Design a protein around this nucleic acid. Structure first.
Length: 849
DNA sequence: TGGGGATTT
């Protein structure tokens, strides 16, 4: 054991801490408490009873409305604004099956509709069931909810379906996504929503009494939410026999969903695209004849294949397939030569380049912009080259979606983002490198890694279709057919990669009290060892007790649209009067950073973040400083100027602002804040006390700690609490920095690409870790008294400061327990506020001088 | 000295 630095406090301070604690200890309406006992007392049978009576709105129909809408429907089908809209709808394949679909829903609780992009299942099925019920005189009984995986898709589909019905958005078609909703009318309506919206809504309506038809779309993508939703349908559907569910899928292991719902009926609806020809690595080199010059088990795969095609391809070509670097994107000048080829031959259309990541997109971009070869300079002024990456601005501007200038061809250099998320309509040529990146958690080593991996058969299929929108196109796949046969069918279902704390907690609100038993009933069951790991995290932050039962704090966390750790952090910030900065840290960690990463500018990006961090050595306070800056720029009408200067997405920021308020209102409704405003003065008296913020940030990120032992840009000898050597990720504001006032850091994410990096970090001080952490004991190991945290970091501390900090931690735990059970804001002049002031005072001993 | 991609009454 090595003894860290001294944390003994001055006698004068300890004497005041003792005084405040004794004031706290001389103190003697909770609707929330009875709800919490009522949840624990009922079994699932009773919960099912209770929820039926409480959500009865659909037991009521409006016959005067049923008839009124039935009349207006027939009438508007003979007008000449519609019935052009109907005749163009009738060219969509789905509409040929309308009547079989209507009947299939009538006779079966669950059906599946499987169809290719272009088939119109998403826009046409909901309209088919709605217009049916209206005509039959049931309009007011019909409320259709259609999920989508992506926010942008949910909206545009809504605007489109609303167009096909001659309505402004919000009469019969609407959308609801997080913090933005154009709600449709109450009854006889179709609502598009993100799958997550529906999940949070389950708490209030656990058995889906507030809808008549659930349509799950794009379930073949296996997002956690669709897979999670389907498992929940097996628990719900035996108790909702009048509910109708329609599953929807691409032709990507569609049979898995049909098998899952026990043998249910399955429609196959044909798609409407232009034919796209698939070429593979043998065919690409055959046309461009590019020359390469500058384990194997490349050979185990490639030679058996080269033998089967000896008579179909030239012998010089087949030799290049022996080169390990011919496939994938190892040689970028190979892809560059494939673009220059298309620019000459293969007449006009745009080129869509699929590259794995930021690094390789930069390489191809510089080559197409700064060519070293004659062929490249010939073409440079004739390409309009757009990089496409979630961290790059090009997606949030209208240039990459419009047609290129005259005499120029549009070339898009993209990640997998352009596969489904982003759509460019004039793409005719797709170059498919076959390589993407994936984050993989290894449960055995507690290491998350970011690796370059092969794409799956489903992916390649999706990138092909991207070329069949305007006219028949070509897709160039830079791998051999011997590779495709060795590629997987689909990507790993993402639920097997995801942290389970959120789900395990959210399940408790649905009275699904055994996460091991329930999660095993999913399409792909997550590793039970990963389930246990989640329960311990929840027991460690005291949201579950040792018996696994929900705790009062745990019920609060489960209701919040954020991970339980950052939910706790937000809660602490309400009790400690730093609501505004902390909810910036929580909102940013959950959603994303507001910062772009434009090509070439990586040095200037580092400088913008150095300045925004204000030497506070915390990535999270840095974002809050940015938001404080953003608000000021809205006050001065410099909003655009400010964002241009600091590489900021106004869209990201505005949505971070919206999340801060959602947290504030929830905390307000739960009786933890006096005001629903995250800026209110009362919620924020401590918001300028930087040592205090670091304490609450650490309470959120604990026990993810790091210790730095080296000084030199600067080199760092730094290791996490598990012992492994790490560095600050270069995108972090602590990379290469020297002269820290403390040697201990907290982090949200640790990830290995070239070394073990902390993607994000906040420097914290020992006394705050000790107060809000666990594994705290006082003793003697040298002839020195110590005070430790996590039983991992042992600090020099005299017996007077230890006995106080231990007694302090008790009263803190006693308070947190009471506030969760009996939520009420901390009054400014009460007993509770004194214990707070005691903690502020001990934490300020670390203030910068 | 480096950042696959969604999302939450």
């Amino acid at each position: 054991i090595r003894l860290g630095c001294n944390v003994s406090a001055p006698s004068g301070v300890l004497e005041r801490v003792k005084e405040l604690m004794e004031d706290y200890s001389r103190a003697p309406d909770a609707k929330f408490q009875q709800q919490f006992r009522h949840l624990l007392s009922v079994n699932f049978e009773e919960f099912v009873a209770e929820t039926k009576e409480r959500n009865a709105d659909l037991d009521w129909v409006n016959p005067k409305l049923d008839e009124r809408l039935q009349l207006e429907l027939g009438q508007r089908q003979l007008e000449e604004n519609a019935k052009k809209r109907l005749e163009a709808r009738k060219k969509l394949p789905t509409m040929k099956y309308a009547d079989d679909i209507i009947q299939a829903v009538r006779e079966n609780q669950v059906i599946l509709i499987v169809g290719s992009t272009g088939c119109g299942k998403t826009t046409q099925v909901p309209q088919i069931l709605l217009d049916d019920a209206i005509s039959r005189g049931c309009a007011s009984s019909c409320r259709i909810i259609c999920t989508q995986p992506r926010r942008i898709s949910a909206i545009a589909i809504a605007e489109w379906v609303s167009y096909e019905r001659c309505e402004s958005l919000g009469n019969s078609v609407g959308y609801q996504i997080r913090l933005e909703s154009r709600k449709a009318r109450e009854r006889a309506s179709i609502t598009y929503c993100t799958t997550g919206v529906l999940l949070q809504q389950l708490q209030s309506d656990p058995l889906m009494h507030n809808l008549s038809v659930l349509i799950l779309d794009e379930i073949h993508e296996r997002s956690v939410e669709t897979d999670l939703l389907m498992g929940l349908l097996k628990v719900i559907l035996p108790h909702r026999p009048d509910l109708k569910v329609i599953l929807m899928s691409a032709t990507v292991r569609e049979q898995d969903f049909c098998d899952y719902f026990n043998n249910c009926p399955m429609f196959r609806i044909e798609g409407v695209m232009f034919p796209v020809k698939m070429l593979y690595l043998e065919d690409v080199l055959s046309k461009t004849n590019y020359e390469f010059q500058k384990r194997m088990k490349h050979e185990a795969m490639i030679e058996p294949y080269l033998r089967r095609i000896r008579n179909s391809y030239d012998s010089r070509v087949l030799d290049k397939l022996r080169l390990p670097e011919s496939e994938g994107c190892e040689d970028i000048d190979f892809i560059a030569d494939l673009v220059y080829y298309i620019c000459e031959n293969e007449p006009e259309g745009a080129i869509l380049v699929f590259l794995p990541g930021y690094d390789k997109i930069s390489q191809l971009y510089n080559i197409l912009d700064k060519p070293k070869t004659s062929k490249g300079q010939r073409w440079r002024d004739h390409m309009a080259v757009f990089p496409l990456h979630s961290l790059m601005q090009s997606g949030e501007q209208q240039a990459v979606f419009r047609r290129p200038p005259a005499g120029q061809r549009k070339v898009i250099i993209s990640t997998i983002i352009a596969e489904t998320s982003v759509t460019i309509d004039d793409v005719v040529y797709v170059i498919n490198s076959g390589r993407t990146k994936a984050t993989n958690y290894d449960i055995e080593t507690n290491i998350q890694s970011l690796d370059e991996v092969w794409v799956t058969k489903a992916n390649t299929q999706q990138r092909r279709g991207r070329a069949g929108r305007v006219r028949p196109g070509i897709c160039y796949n830079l791998f051999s057919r011997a590779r495709e046969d060795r590629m997987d069918d689909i990507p790993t279902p993402e639920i097997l990669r995801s942290k389970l704390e959120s789900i395990i907690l959210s399940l408790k609100l649905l009275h699904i009290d055994d996460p091991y038993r329930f999660l095993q009933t999913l399409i792909n069951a997550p590793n039970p060892e990963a389930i246990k790991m989640g329960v311990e995290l929840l027991k460690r932050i005291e949201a579950l007790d040792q018996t696994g039962t929900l705790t009062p704090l745990g019920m609060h966390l489960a209701k919040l649209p954020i991970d339980p750790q950052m939910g706790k952090m937000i809660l602490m910030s309400a009790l400690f009067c730093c609501l505004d900065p902390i909810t910036s840290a929580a909102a940013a960690l959950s959603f994303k950073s507001p910062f772009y990463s434009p090509l070439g500018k990586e040095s200037r990006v580092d400088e913008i973040k150095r300045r925004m961090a204000r030497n506070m050595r915390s990535d999270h306070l840095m974002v809050h400083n940015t938001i404080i800056a953003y608000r000021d720029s809205r006050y001065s009408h410099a909003e655009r100027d400010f964002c241009y200067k600091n590489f900021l997405s106004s869209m990201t920021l505005q949505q971070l602002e919206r999340m801060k308020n959602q947290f504030s209102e929830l905390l307000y409704n739960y009786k933890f804040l006096a005001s629903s405003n995250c800026k209110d003065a009362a919620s924020n008296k401590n918001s300028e006390k930087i040592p205090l913020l670091r304490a609450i940030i650490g309470a959120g990120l604990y026990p993810n700690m790091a210790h730095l032992r080296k000084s030199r840009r600067a080199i760092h000898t730094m290791a996490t609490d598990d012992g492994r050597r790490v560095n600050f990720h270069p995108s972090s504001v602590n990379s290469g920095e020297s002269g820290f006032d403390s040697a201990y850091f907290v982090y949200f994410q640790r990830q290995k690409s070239t070394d073990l990096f902390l993607l994000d970090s906040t420097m914290v001080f020992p006394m705050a870790l000790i107060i809000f952490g666990d594994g705290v004991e006082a003793g003697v190991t040298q002839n020195t008294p110590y005070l430790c945290v996590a039983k991992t970091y042992y600090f020099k501390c005299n017996r007077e400061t230890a006995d106080v900090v231990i007694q302090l931690r008790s009263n803190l735990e006693k308070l947190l327990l009471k506030k969760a059970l009996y939520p009420a804001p901390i009054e400014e002049n009460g007993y509770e506020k004194q214990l707070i002031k005691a903690i502020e005072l001990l934490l300020s001993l670390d203030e910068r001088l």
